Amino acid sequence: EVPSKESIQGDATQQSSKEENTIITRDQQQTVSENIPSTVGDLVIASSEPTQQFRSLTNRWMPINSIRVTVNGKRNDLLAQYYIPEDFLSTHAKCAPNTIPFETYVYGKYELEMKFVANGNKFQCGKVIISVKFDSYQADNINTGFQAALSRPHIMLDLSTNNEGVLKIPFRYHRAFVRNQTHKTATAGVRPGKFASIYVQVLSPLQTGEGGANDMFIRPFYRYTRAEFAGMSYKVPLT
């Protein structure tokens, strides 16, 4: 919260997060969304058998794809978007150990946390907003602007201060569990692997100074704070 005078290694007042075998430091402050509840009480009824957790595999930080922000981005533009858990299983960081349990269990309840790290320089400026939309299947294209993002659980990133942001995502779905994988033998009547959407949008365009860089980058990291699996099956490759 408070800086110190310069020494051999500059202003050594960083903070950090350690989850399992992964650590992430931050140079400035961090903004965190509220810790909110998931539906509880349906788990013991939707599954006659015990559900499982594998924290050492799922609760570690995993970086996903890099996000490029340029001076040409306009307010409301989608910089990136994720359908979860689907995109974290078959499109981003595919070899991550966090994905292991999804190969053998057919159902699950998931609570996540997403950390966003930005690196714009002191002569740049801009604002980005990241928000989550619960149970978004077939409703991604409405209530999808920066206004809806500012109303739902979200975090804001300033591109010159480089504050970190942590989005806490509870499990809010219209069914007890979300299905983990599609399969040639599984039904096509229910689209699986998606209980929410994460949007990364431009709030105010990135700007730079004379001869400055026309872009900068943001990196998202995810981790399950609570991943419960149900319905064991033979292992299958993801999507």
Binding site: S7, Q9, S17, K18, N21, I23, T25
Partner: protein, 243 residues
């Protein structure tokens, strides 16, 4: 010694420090610097003693780069691996040492002739090998072991080996371990500060001997110098476990 911890200002999280493996296989810990310096180092391997000389001189100094062999330089009577022994490697990090050294001398013989080992305190020179003191041509009538200096005798028929401990008989607080150039001609009193005296071995008849050296029990090193520039070509002389 300055660890440099003073420059490590990062205070963010880290992985575990684990549990030490020291003592897991056995209780024979070998990390004590003095323990290492107390195990013998071979200096001379089967060198000749000739009665026409005063004796074979051994300068009192621990193993270090001062005795390192360099491919291409003139052949000396020093064994060639002294510079790569663990104790020479340690001494190359400390320019000061104080205390006694122990010499294990082996006379390759079983004769009943006595071989004398005479101790000479710090006198200012630094020599090794056979020498005719004051360049005379006969020494049996004026033996160095019969002049008054401390002397001990070996009688091979009883035991061809002996272990003698030489004192720290010098005017200085510390002995200087090494120089950047052992052959540079600089201020003569300083030149002799790398030894604390000599050990002279004198036979009755021509015979060979071997010499080992180690630190005594009353011994300390100091004036840590940090590591020097080094080299290694070990990789080239062995197969890896993948053919």
């Amino acid at each position: 010694m300055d660890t440099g911890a003073k420059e490590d200002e990062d205070e963010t999280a880290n992985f575990s420090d684990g549990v030490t493996a020291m003592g897991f296989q056995s209780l024979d810990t070998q990390v004590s610097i003095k323990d290492i310096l107390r195990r013998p180092v071979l200096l001379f391997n089967h060198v000749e003693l000739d009665p026409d000389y005063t004796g074979f001189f051994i300068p009192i100094m621990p193993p270090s780069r001062m005795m390192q062999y360099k491919s291409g330089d003139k052949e000396t009577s020093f064994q060639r691996l002294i510079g790569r022994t663990p104790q020479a490697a340690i001494m190359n990090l400390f320019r000061f040492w104080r205390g006694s050294l122990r010499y294990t001398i082996i006379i390759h013989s079983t004769d009943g002739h006595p071989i004398y080992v005479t101790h000479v305190p710090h006198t200012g020179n630094r020599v090794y090998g056979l020498m005719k003191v004051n360049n005379l041509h006969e020494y049996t009538k004026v033996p160095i072991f019969g002049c008054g200096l401390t002397t001990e005798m070996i009688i091979p028929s009883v035991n061809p080996s002996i272990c003698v401990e030489v004192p720290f008989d010098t005017e200085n607080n510390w002995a200087v371990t090494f120089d950047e150039d052992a052959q540079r001609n600089y201020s003569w009193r300083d030149k002799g500060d790398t030894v604390t005296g000599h050990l002279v071995v004198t036979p009755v008849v021509s015979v060979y001997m071997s010499v080992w050296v180690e630190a005594g029990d009353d011994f300390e090193v100091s004036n840590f110098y940090g590591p020097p520039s080094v080299k290694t070509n070990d990789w080239n002389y062995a197969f890896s476990d993948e053919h």
